[PDB]
């Protein structure tokens, strides 16, 4: 599923991400924009660790989900990487909560590069929340 921005905003808020461990909704919307363009089926190969980033949060297979093919890997979220690409982002959100709790918001390099020290208020512009 590719989300519209405000549709995603509403979904992330319903799933308890607004302010979760100090990360505002608009920050999550900026992160997911730059990571995946709001596409739940986004994938990107990471040759540095021969791994793949999956779904709207671009969660990596070396650490956080099982995909079988990744060498020297663990499954921190106890989930198949496929489940992090479901149209229903519930499992993806649960795993993001785990990641941010364990490693902090800086776990997402895309957030550091595009969102940190930027005004991200525009991500909720025109959304009913
Ligand atoms: Na894994």
Domain tally, the chain? 1
The domain containing residue 114 runs over which residues?
1-129
Centre of ligand 1 from the C-alpha of residue 95, in Å = 13
Q: Please, what sign has the CA dihedral across residues 27, 30, 36, 38?
A: positive
Centre of ligand 1 from the C-alpha of residue 111, in Å = 22
6 backbone φψ class: left, alpha, beta (φ>0; ψ -120 to 50) = alpha
Centre of ligand 1 from the C-alpha of residue 75, in Å = 4
| Active site positions, annotated | 35, 53
- For residue 47, the tally of other CB atoms under 10 A from its CB is 6
Centre of ligand 1 from the C-alpha of residue 82, in Å = 11
Under DSSP, the state recorded for 82 is G
Distances (CA, A) of 6 to 33, 71, 112, 121, 122: 12, 38, 23, 13, 11
What's the reported resolution, in angstroms, to a tenth?
A: 1.5
Residue 19 sits in a domain whose CATH number is 1.10.530.10
């Amino acid at each position: 599923k590719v989300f519209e921005r405000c549709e995603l905003a509403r979904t992330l808020k319903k799933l308890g991400l607004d302010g979760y461990k100090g990360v505002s909704l608009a920050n999550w919307l900026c992160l997911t924009k730059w990571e995946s363009s709001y596409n739940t089926k986004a994938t990107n190969y990471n040759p540095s660790s021969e791994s793949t980033d999956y779904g709207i949060f671009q969660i990596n297979s070396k650490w956080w989900c099982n995909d079988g093919k990744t060498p020297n890997a663990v499954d921190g979220c106890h989930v198949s990487c496929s489940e992090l690409m479901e149209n229903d982002i519930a499992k993806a959100v649960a795993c993001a909560k785990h990641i941010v709790s364990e490693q902090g918001i800086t776990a997402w390099v895309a957030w550091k590069s595009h969102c940190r020290d930027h005004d991200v208020s525009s991500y909720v512009e025109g959304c009913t929340l």
